[PDB]
Amino acid sequence: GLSDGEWQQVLNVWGKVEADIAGHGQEVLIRLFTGHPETLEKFDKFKHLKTEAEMKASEDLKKHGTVVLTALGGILKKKGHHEAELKPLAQSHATKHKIPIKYLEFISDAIIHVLHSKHPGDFGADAQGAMTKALELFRNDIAAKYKELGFQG
Amino acid sequence: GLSDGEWQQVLNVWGKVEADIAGHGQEVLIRLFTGHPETLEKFDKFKHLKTEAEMKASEDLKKHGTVVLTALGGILKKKGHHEAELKPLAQSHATKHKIPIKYLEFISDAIIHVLHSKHPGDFGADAQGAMTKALELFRNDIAAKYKELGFQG
Numbered sequence: 456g457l458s459d460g461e462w463q464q465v466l467n468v469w470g471k472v473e474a475d476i477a478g479h480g481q482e483v484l485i486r487l488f489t490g491h492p493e494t495l496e497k498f499d500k501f502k503h504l505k506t507e508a509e510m511k512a513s514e515d516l517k518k519h520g521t522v523v524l525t526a527l528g529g530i531l532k533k534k535g536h537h538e539a540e541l542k543p544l545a546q547s548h549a550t551k552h553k554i555p556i557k558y559l560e561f562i563s564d565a566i567i568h569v570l571h572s573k574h575p576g577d578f579g580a581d582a583q584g585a586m587t588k589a590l591e592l593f594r595n596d597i598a599a600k601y602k603e604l605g606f607q608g
Numbered sequence: 609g610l611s612d613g614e615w616q617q618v619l620n621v622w623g624k625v626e627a628d629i630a631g632h633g634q635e636v637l638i639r640l641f642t643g644h645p646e647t648l649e650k651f652d653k654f655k656h657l658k659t660e661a662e663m664k665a666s667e668d669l670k671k672h673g674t675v676v677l678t679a680l681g682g683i684l685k686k687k688g689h690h691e692a693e694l695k696p697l698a699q700s701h702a703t704k705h706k707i708p709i710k711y712l713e714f715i716s717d718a719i720i721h722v723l724h725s726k727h728p729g730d731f732g733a734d735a736q737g738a739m740t741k742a743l744e745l746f747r748n749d750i751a752a753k754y755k756e757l758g759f760q761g
């Protein structure tokens with residue numbers, strides 16, 4: 456994973472990307488298609504393009520490059536936000552508090568019980584299943600950080 | 609990992625939690641500590657709490673309950689935001705376009721090339737390493753969705 460400064464570096468350079476997203480998107484796809492021409496075959500609209508000049512002249516290529524970099528930017532930003540909260544929690548619970556995954560299972564059990572007890576009208580079988588799944592995602596994401604850190608959990 | 613309706617159900621019950629985060633948190637920790645007393649042994653600052661009534665009386669147990677559920681809610685919500693960004697892309701790239709991970713590697717390297725080419729002062733060695741790592745996280749996250757969707761990338 457990335458450190459906090461590395462995430463900020465990603466954000467900073469993406470701001471440059473978004474300041475000229477059309478130019479960046481064009482250049483990315485041109486680099487892809489010239490370096491790896493087989494990738495062109497995936498694109499009905501593009502697969503006839505043979506030269507960088509032809510690629511730069513394609514309005515369809517330019518708008519697709521923007522679509523790609525817009526989508527990737529959002530994924531990167533949202534990953535960064537999740538990481539910024541997950542990472543410190545995994546770090547402290549692995550290295551200072553030394554909390555095994557089974558104990559995260561136990562608190563998940565308690566959360567499910569408390570929610571069912573307090574809010575049965577908002578916690579029927581499907582909603583309880585949803586929360587059970589969500590808490591498992593959380594535990595798994597912590598466990599993956601534990602493994603990176605070397606903590607048995 | 610959850611459907612859209614399941615995420616809605618999670619966020620709906622979480623809104624109920626947020627109407628009294630401290631009460632919910634207190635109740636979760638007391639459930640945990642009463643059911644699994646070894647978990648209370650991890651909290652050196654709660655060594656004075658032995659009985660259920662003592663737990664109920666503790667200002668700091670309740671405050672810690674707030675800390676725990678505030679953190680968990682942020683992580684759950686941010687996971688949901690990231691999932692929702694990954695979802696449309698993994699759907700199409702697995703099931704319609706059928707883009708191998710090797711082609712995602714190619715476009716990742718193309719992005720790094722373009723950023724180096726365009727911004728060498730800003731996008732030096734460390735920032736390039738950051739972006740390289742971030743794009744690997746992206747590819748691995750899509751690869752995990754591919755396997756859930758039955759697509760060998």
Ligand code: HEM
Binds near residue numbers: 527707712715716
């Ligand atoms: C950073 C990686 C990538 C991102 C963020 C990305 C994003 C997108 C987006 C947002 C769309 C339009 C909506 C959709 O169909 O999902 C799209 C379409 C498509 N992508 Fe990707 N893509 C990536 C990599 C690739 C690669 C490497 C290839 C092929 C070698 C590819 C092939 C396609 C194809 C064929 C379409 C449909 C084009 C059309 O019919 O207009 N994608 N991509």
Ligand code: HEM
Binds near residue numbers: 548554650676679
């Ligand atoms: C939903 C799961 C959990 C969440 C979101 C959570 C959250 C937190 C947060 C936000 C802190 C303060 C900042 C930090 O040190 O990271 C904390 C501290 C701590 N957590 Fe957790 N925690 C969870 C589960 C557990 C479990 C199950 C245990 C023990 C069995 C545990 C033991 C501790 C301890 C010992 C501290 C330090 C308390 C003190 O300040 O003295 N945590 N936790």
Ligand SMILES: [O]
Binds near residue numbers: 523
């Ligand atoms: O794409």
Ligand SMILES: [O]
Binds near residue numbers: 676
């Ligand atoms: O905690």
